[PDB]
Amino acid sequence: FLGLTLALSKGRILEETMPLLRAAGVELLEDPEASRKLIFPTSNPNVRVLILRASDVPTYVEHGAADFGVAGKDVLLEHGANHVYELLDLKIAQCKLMTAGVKDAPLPNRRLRIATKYVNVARAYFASQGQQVDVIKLYGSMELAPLVGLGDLIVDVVDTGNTLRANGLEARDHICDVSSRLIVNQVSYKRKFALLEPILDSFKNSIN
Amino acid sequence: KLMTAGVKDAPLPNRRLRIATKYVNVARAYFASQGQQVDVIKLYGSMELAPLVGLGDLIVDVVDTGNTLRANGLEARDHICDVSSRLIVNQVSYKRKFALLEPILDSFKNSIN
């Protein structure tokens, strides 16, 4: 395959990205949800897409198995974005990385336990606040952790906060703002700019 | 069972093999016990895609029937080890709450025989 391979995150990112893709001439030919398929062709025959778990997007892109991708800045911060180019803030799927604890429970004045997917972000953040922590890696959902004492706080992405409140939790501290970004493989940017440029101009235009 | 898996009838490249897997530690351990050097790539999601777009040469995954592998143009290669579900217990809870645990453990033990 001599064209571009585009890595997309599952779920909400896919919904909000479809418009940008259609504007750049790259609509999916079929629905991914009702498909037992891994590599998807598009209306442009030089572009195919991969539908990945969000945390795998930077991995596929930096290793060149996809030439470019759409990934949350939360994922990029947690992963490390040293081996890709973060070309565009797509200003979609806005949310923010936050600490969160039990509703109206005060912070204990001891070493905190953080239970989170975002282990590196968590370490970095609590370091910048000069605070010592014990971090516990979780792969799944995090809202349960404080409720059974696994950790005192969690680090998670929060939009509305409805999920937190529905589980007796509340956002505490704001870590940073998060949105989806267009990342590009370093080699693909050099070797395949001619294929990328129109699509990047279209995305840039679709944002304003 | 935990198995290595690759593209159907694709030959081993002469260079250092790339493993794309959830099971990073198992992968390192296994290929170490075969005296083989590997480059491991951590994946969090589904793994069947990785060999098909060249992310890695092989994957390590749990396989039952293997229908998922064949349906994606992949084939099981090596058997790593057998896998089944286990009952694990917290060390402190085993000491502090044995009275609550024992009947439940006896029932599970009996349900297996």
Place this chain on the structure above:
Amino acid sequence: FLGLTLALSKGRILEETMPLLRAAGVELLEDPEASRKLIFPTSNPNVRVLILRASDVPTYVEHGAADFGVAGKDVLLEHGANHVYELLDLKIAQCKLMTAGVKDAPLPNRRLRIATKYVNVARAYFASQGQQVDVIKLYGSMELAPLVGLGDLIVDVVDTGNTLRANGLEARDHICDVSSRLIVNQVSYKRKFALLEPILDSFKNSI
């Protein structure tokens, strides 16, 4: 002993230093040459002297077994003078460090062999000339080495050069100028300056 211990070199340095000592109030009570004695008292009861091989002077001084000493700059350069203070050029026993070879024998085009006491000086010098060498440490006299092919050159101190010519050798390159120096232990300079100062002023004036 609460006074100053002064380390002196054996032969020529001792002759040329005696005047400076007498002027600063520190004459020996007796002749060292005709004496089976190691620590010598002086006319000043706060000063005693040690008569050492020249290469041991910096050793006794830096370790504080002598508070100050007279040593050739050749010795100091070879030894390392990092742990002592070189206070005074006494302008005595002037000579110079030189390379030397067989008379009118040309330098071979291959890697040179240096046979010398002054191993560190030799390495440093030939390094500064961008020249590669094989150095051979000698403890005794060096004039013989080129005559039996042990090395191509020697590094040695030369005054007149009479010893070189008498053995069919000639001075070749000038490395640096050498004279005797007054060295002082770092701690002794701080703790015992009151005892040292007059003696150092007298030496400075005697020069």
Place this chain on the structure above:
Amino acid sequence: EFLGLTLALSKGRILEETMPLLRAAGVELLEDPEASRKLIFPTSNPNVRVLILRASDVPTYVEHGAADFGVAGKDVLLEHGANHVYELLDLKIAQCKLMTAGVKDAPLPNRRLRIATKYVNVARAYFASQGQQVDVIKLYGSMELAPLVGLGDLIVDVVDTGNTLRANGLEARDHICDVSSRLIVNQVSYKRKFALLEPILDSFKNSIN
């Protein structure tokens, strides 16, 4: 120019005790070295000349081939390293022994001991074999003074009678090893010039009994 054997001899006492062995092998000096401003000495055998060196330079001249063979104390050989020469004969002359020595009845300090010595490598080796840590200070000249002005706690030196130690308020402490003069030979000279060496070595061997 010179196709014969070059023999390296140590200056003082070794020279006295070696002259007999040389005369028996046909290699007397033509003149007195003490009253001579001369570096290479011819002998009654025209295939042999001698060099009169400081003792510590004997192994150096021999291993580098500037002398084909030499007479050196085992103290010198141990200190220098004798890896590049052949120690062919114990000449059983200039017997003495390597010893530690300290101030008379001075007790060992509780801290790490300081050794002031010519024999730096021997000193390190010896105190290592006794499982003891030391700080060694190299001296080139006489060593008897060092303990008396606190340069070191002990010295390592060759001791025969011990008169020099006692006369300076020092006493022998430990025996390190026995020392005598040895005949050393250059590796290449042993292979290339055995025919010249053999009679002289047989004569030395016989002179020892």
Place this chain on the structure above:
Amino acid sequence: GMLPDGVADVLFEDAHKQEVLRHQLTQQLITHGYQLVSPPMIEFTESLLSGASEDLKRQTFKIIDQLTGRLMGIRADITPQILRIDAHHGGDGIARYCYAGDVIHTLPSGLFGSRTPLQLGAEIFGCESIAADIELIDVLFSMINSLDMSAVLHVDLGHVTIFKRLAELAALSASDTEQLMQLYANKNLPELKQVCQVLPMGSDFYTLARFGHDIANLLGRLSENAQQDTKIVTAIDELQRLKAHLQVQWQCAVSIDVTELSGYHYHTGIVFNGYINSETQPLVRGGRFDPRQATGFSMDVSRLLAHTQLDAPFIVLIDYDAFNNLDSAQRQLLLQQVASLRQQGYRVTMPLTAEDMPVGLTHRLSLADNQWRLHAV
């Protein structure tokens, strides 16, 4: 011997003495208002060697944290850790810290030195005044005096500001600064004289080495441009105050060397070096350092061992046979008596066998007429 160069066991009575010294000196500092901190032996090099000199970097062993792949160091000096601690905990006002802990060096720092010193120190942060340096001197000398040594401490004062201002005003290159520093370290007066003839303000640099010891007249020997620099004037004034304080208050022999420029990197002003008798390496090193003021000192506790003495210990052995003949109630009373002896600092061994013999035995606890009593051996 089995151990590396510059690495030594401290055993038996020496270890006991080291423990007493460390504890007493620590307690003294605590009672003068210094907060004890005990940072760890290892940190990530990011923190440990933040703004470290090239020397401190070479002195610090590197090791790899297998949990992160990152570089850690084993501390060669505690002071940077005190900086880290004061940044997070100290605020803007005055703060006092003390410490005592092992540090490790890659190489011995001078001839025959230790690579495993037990570093004890005190530091005052957040005070600009020379009064903080004077308090530290008073604390140090109070500590030294508590040790009842016959060995005497000589103090050498320097002040890095003087040479740094001269280096500024004369606009010296890196090369020329290095060369003067090397020459100063060696007090090589002849070669310094030569180099100074061809340097800008070279007369002043020569004066530092030749007449720096005479601090009463140093200002008046300096050039006009030097004499009109306030920092140079203040520095020389600080030296004169400390010198006077040490002589008046403590009867201390003080020498001055304004060319003492070890730790040109970390020192920012006055420096102190305390020498014990005629030992080459200073027992005590101290100075001003580094938007926060700081001054402090440190020492190797282990170097005090040779100059300090404790009373003979009382080492007691209970008689084996007599003890095993006791009934249970007699044993309990003896043990109560032994506990009391131990509370008073007697070292009491309860023998496992008839041959069980404590090292350095001084007394037996023996049974006569239904009574246990001590008698010397």
Place this chain on the structure above:
Amino acid sequence: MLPDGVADVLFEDAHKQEVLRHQLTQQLITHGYQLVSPPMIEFTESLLSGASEDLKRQTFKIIDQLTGRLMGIRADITPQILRIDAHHGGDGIARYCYAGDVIHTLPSGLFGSRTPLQLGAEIFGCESIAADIELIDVLFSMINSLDMSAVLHVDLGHVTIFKRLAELAALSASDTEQLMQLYANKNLPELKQVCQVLPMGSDFYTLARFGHDIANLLGRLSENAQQDTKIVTAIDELQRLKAHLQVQWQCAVSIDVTELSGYHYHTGIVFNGYINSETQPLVRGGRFDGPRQATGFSMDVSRLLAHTQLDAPFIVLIDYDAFNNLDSAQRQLLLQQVASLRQQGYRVTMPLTAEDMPVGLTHRLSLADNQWRLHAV
């Protein structure tokens, strides 16, 4: 900022750590144990001589720049005690104690320390169970001196029992490993299965099922097991220690003869002291190898900090203005008074300025009615 398993101990915690280290060290010394303070680094030749694979992985490696040879930072002090006893201890009984920092490459337990302050005691050269009883006495005397509310639970094991059964039943390496794994996991069902097809498999099952009841363990074992002297002696040792701990010290004791951690280094009886319900033992001890007998224990002093309390400190500030208004003779009297307070352990700060404020201030020393006195804040 700091690596995982690496922590500052600061302020009152550091003070408390210093008190604990000092008191516990002194207690050991008064029981006849010789204090030794080996260095943090040695050549791996000595440091890792006869080390387990685990100890090797736990030990950081560094290079001695003076010799090119490999050194380690100690992860455990016991091998250094072996080294020390070989050179200094002779053939008789010898007692050693120690307290020093050790470093581990990886934490042992979830969020556990890689920089423990390891304190211990060891008895060499005594075959008798009496040496293990003396150690228990020393340990419990120390624990009791701490006035904790936390309770120490003791678990006793004895590796000899399983090792003799493994010998007598001629088990393979494979089968030994499998039983050990099954014991570690308390997997009774799979153990029962594996034991039906093993020689003397009945005895291996009995260890896991009835090992806790040490009074009857011998009588449940097979005839071949019951006639093994080593098995009999081991069970006898367990019964003596258990009784001694309960009688003399009112200790809760559990027995687990399937406890086989350190199968490598342990050669007999083993002790594990747990504090409340903490997963990792506070104290680990037991018999090991010096042909020289050895037994001992060690603990991380830093883990005592959470369970120990000191009295509130008195932190005193002298009034700045009042002090500077004093004449010389008034100052000398105040300083005498301050010295006295400091001797009693009051932490007295002499202020540098009017704003100089000690952390945690509790009292001012103030001037009222021609008299200096403490008043709370």
Place this chain on the structure above:
Amino acid sequence: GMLPDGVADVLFEDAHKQEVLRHQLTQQLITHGYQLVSPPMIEFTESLLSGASEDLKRQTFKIIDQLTGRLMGIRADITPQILRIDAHHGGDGIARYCYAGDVIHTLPSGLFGSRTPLQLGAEIFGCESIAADIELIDVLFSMINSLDMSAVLHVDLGHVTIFKRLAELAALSASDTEQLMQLYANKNLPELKQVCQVLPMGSDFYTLARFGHDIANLLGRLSENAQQDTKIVTAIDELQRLKAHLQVQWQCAVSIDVTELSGYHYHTGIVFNGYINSETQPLVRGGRFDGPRQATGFSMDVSRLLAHTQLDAPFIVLIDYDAFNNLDSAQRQLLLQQVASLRQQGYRVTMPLTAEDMPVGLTHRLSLADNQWRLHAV
């Protein structure tokens, strides 16, 4: 000094010559059926120093792998790496390996010797027969002969088995073995004679030093207990076969020294030492060693051949700057074709960047005269 002791640049024609030697000698080995392997300069000490002598350990620089915290070495010898490689890849049958690579030593052997030799070697695994040692000799001598040196290689054969069997049969202590070995190393016959009067079978140990060179009669001078040891008999037989083979097949000067016991640790039988002219340190060291796997091999420092080998003078050519820039495009293309041809034949042709651009050691100009580019010497 600019560079450390025992560390030297190899520059210019010497470097060219080193490259030719390395390449030719490697190719020769490959054409004799030896498989080339190129192991890395660094390994974990677990593998690199597995069963290493104390000497090899001291010779090996240590470094730390920052990825694992574990200890690595820079190789001082390639043979242990060949063992590692043969364990994984070689099977139970015969396997042949060759190699050429840099090794580093902490200290020189020999006064002013190299610490950075370019170690080239060949090894045969899995053959018990003396035939494997004979094949290696053939390979080695074919290589030596291809070099067209005037320097002569002298071969010294030893065999450690002989002294080891005598040491066993006479039940010598560690102390006594060390003392005999020291005395052998120094050829100290008088003190050896003394020590041997008071040792069991001491007569045989003396005979090794005094009559070991005469291998035809060594067996018959030995004691009855020695003569009835099969290993002693076989060893002496092996020496006689190699000696004969070297003299007959290769016209080699062979000396025998059964007291040659360097590498008592690693050698397990026959040993070979090749000396170039009268150089003290052997150019070639070889002999039997351990892989239960048989192994024999040799190695040499290629850099020590540089002083004894010669290449033809090179042709170093400069194209004339002015003439070239005066050419039209089609004339340039023809010249470049001619230059390409010269380069294919091994002429070193510089295309000048400027009129002053001057190759070092210039021998010819390629110049324009009539309608023709031609070489003319300078």
Place this chain on the structure above:
Amino acid sequence: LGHVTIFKRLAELAALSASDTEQLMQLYANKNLPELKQVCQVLPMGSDFYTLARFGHDIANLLGRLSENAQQDTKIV
């Protein structure tokens, strides 16, 4: 192809600190355009530094997109 002179001349002409040079270099290495845009709004000649990352690939027109001070630097040209 690249050319370090261009950024070094811009860093000179804009008189950048060590800190600011390091930050731009880190951002360039990552081709982080959003954060670079932010940092460049508050830097002297920051427009030129942004242009390098955004339009450096089009070398035919790079000179004409640069500032007047940049365009008059001979080394840049």
